[PDB]
Structures are given as C-alpha cells and as structure tokens.
Design an enzyme around this catalytic site. Structure first.
Site, PDB file in Angstrom:
ATOM      1  CB  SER A   1      35.701  34.776  46.792  1.00 28.68           C
ATOM      2  OG  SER A   1      35.639  34.514  48.177  1.00 28.68           O
TER       3      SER A   1
ATOM      4  CG  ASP B   1      46.891  36.506  45.242  1.00 31.54           C
ATOM      5  OD1 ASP B   1      47.612  36.457  44.223  1.00 31.54           O
ATOM      6  OD2 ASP B   1      47.016  37.392  46.112  1.00 31.54           O
TER       7      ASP B   1
ATOM      8  CG  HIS C   1      40.854  35.833  46.255  1.00 34.48           C
ATOM      9  ND1 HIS C   1      41.128  34.662  45.581  1.00 34.48           N
ATOM     10  CD2 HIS C   1      39.522  35.822  46.496  1.00 34.48           C
ATOM     11  CE1 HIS C   1      40.013  33.972  45.428  1.00 34.48           C
ATOM     12  NE2 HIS C   1      39.023  34.653  45.975  1.00 34.48           N
TER      13      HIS C   1
END
Lengths: 52, 151, 151
Positions: free
Chosen positions: C103, C51, C29
């Site tokens: 992330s 993703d 992502h």
C-alpha cells in the site's frame, strides 16, 4: 471646549487613516518595478499623481 | 562587475545592495552604510511587512542601470556563490553556500535579468531553501519558506 | 534511496509512507506505526471515507522529499517493482508484481516526479489494474473501480 477637542480628535483620526492609507498606497508600489499605476493614481489619486 | 554591487557597514559586510532600473532597494533588516556613499542622502520608504526600504535612483546612475524581468521560468539559475535550483515555487541552494552576511544579494537569471532578491534561508539538510521577495507582474510578493532566518 | 520512504510496524512492512513536498502521507487503510521514530512524535490527520492520513513535515529533512506534478500524460511510468503501463486513464500491470501489503507505491514518470499513490489491485485474469489516489488541478481524488482486491 472638550466637545471641540473630541471633534478635533475625530478629524485627527481622519487624517490618521488618510496617512496610513497613503503609506499603504505606496506599499504595493514603493518602487516595485514595472513602475506603473494601472489605474490607481488615475482613479484613487492617492499621492504624487505625476507618474505617467 | 559582471553584475556585481555591494553593501557594507561599520566593519561588517552586509551582503549586497543593487539597482533595478529606477529603484535602489535596501532589505529592511540591513542597516547602515551604502556601498556608494552618495546614496545615503536619499529618503527611504519602509515596508516592514514586505521587508524593504526603497529609494528612487537619480539621473547620474542612468548609465549604471541594470535589467530585470517579470516572467518566471522553472529550473536553475546562476548567482555569485553558485547555483539555485528553483523548483515548485522554491529556491534551493547547496548547504553552506549561503551564510548570515549574504543579505541583499540579488539573483540574476540565465539571461542576466534580476529575477529576485534574497532575504534569508531555511535549511533542509542536503540543500537549503531561500526566503526572498520577487515581483510577479505588477506586484511584489514575499516568497518565503517558513522558519526563515536573517542572512 | 531512489525514492524509498516506507511504513513498517513490528516486522511487517505495511507499504510506504513518503514525504512529498508539503506532506507526509500515511496510508490509513492499513494499520501500524512509523518506520523511523523521529517523526513518530508528529501529529496525524485521518480521513474517514477516503482513508488516508496526513502529517505536516519538519523542515530538517525536506531536501529528501520528492516533487509532484498533478497532471497525466499517457505511457509508461516507474515504480518500486519496475515499470507500470498507464493508458486509457488507467493504471495497469501484470498479475503478481504487486502483492496485498504494497500500500503506497509512489508512481513517477520517466524523469521521476510523483503523480499517484497506489492503494489496491483488481483483475479478471491477467491484467491487474491499480486502484489509487489521484490529483487534478492540485485537488485530491480517490479512484477505485469496483471489485478491487484490497491491499
């Protein structure tokens, strides 16, 4: 005579799959301990049927 | 002999070769002379896919036998060069604790029962995983980290 | 190195990228390249509607890889910005401890074995809940409530 030879070859392949199946019968339980055929020598009766 | 058994051939020690109940194993990459030279006169069975040659223990080693298990715990196990961290289906030793020539060494547990037999290793740096063959309740399975080598 | 395995490009950290066991993860992502270029040569598999990104690991660093357990008991877990309050089947934290750009923080419990990888956050105020990937019976899942502010 060669038809006789070809059928002799065919039963030679029959004993060939028999002996390959026998070595593949022992490949699970060569002496892999536990030392047991749960149902295999009772039903299949591959080789050496005198193990319990 | 805490639980100590051997194999050696023609001036190179081939590691170990032991007795599990009625079975004397030989790892199929080991070739040559048994540590107990009365055992070389018995017919072995080759399983190249499972990498063994097995033999039936006669009666005169009945008092010489050793014990094994089928269950599998998770954690740490002692063996002769030291410890094995078995985690996640993987046996891991400190790097250099094994060597080529450590072939056919067993692994006994934290009880003394034979849990697996070595076949080789695979280095991951800070430790080294172990390619082995175990039993898993009525079958053997060759448990192998890839990229293995003959030890 | 507690469990620090990171993804970086051009000066910006785009979160983490870890090798967990069998897997190298890349959060697909978020764009970028690898942190350390020894694994830049390796292949990668992208997911489209979920993703993530995958890579099959070379063995020569796999001792540094972490261990997983794909089950979920309640309580408090550890991550890169401290503890994390996991209750009600849901991961919670105060507002601000994760920023957009974090992330992939690997979650692990009070003995340090990996359970979840964080993707984004959400809030109606003060209690930020963390949209993640999850596992169940060693199958992957991707869990995200609606209205989640994406990292």
């Amino acid at each position: 005579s060669v038809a006789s030879f070809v059928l002799l070859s065919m039963v030679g392949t029959a004993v060939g799959m028999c002996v390959c199946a026998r070595r593949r019968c022992i490949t699970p339980y060569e002496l892999t301990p536990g030392a047991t055929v749960p149902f295999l020598l009772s039903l299949l009766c591959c080789v050496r049927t005198t193990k319990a | 002999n805490d639980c100590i058994f051997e194999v050696k051939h023609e001036g190179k020690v081939m590691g170990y070769a032991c007795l599990v109940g009625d079975k004397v194993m030989k790892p199929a990459h080991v070739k040559g002379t048994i540590d107990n030279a009365d055992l070389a006169k018995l017919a072995f069975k080759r399983s190249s896919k499972y990498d063994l040659e097995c033999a039936q223990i006669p009666v005169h080693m009945k008092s010489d036998a050793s014990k094994f298990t089928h269950e599998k715990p998770e954690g740490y196990y002692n063996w002769h060069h030291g410890a094995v961290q078995y985690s996640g289906g993987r046996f891991t030793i400190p790097t250099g604790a094994g060597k080529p020539g450590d072939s056919g060494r067993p692994i006994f547990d934290n009880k003394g029962r034979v849990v697996a037999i070595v076949l080789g290793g695979a280095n991951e740096g800070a430790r080294t995983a172990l390619s082995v063959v175990t039993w898993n309740k009525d079958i053997v399975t060759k448990i192998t980290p890839e990229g293995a080598e003959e030890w």
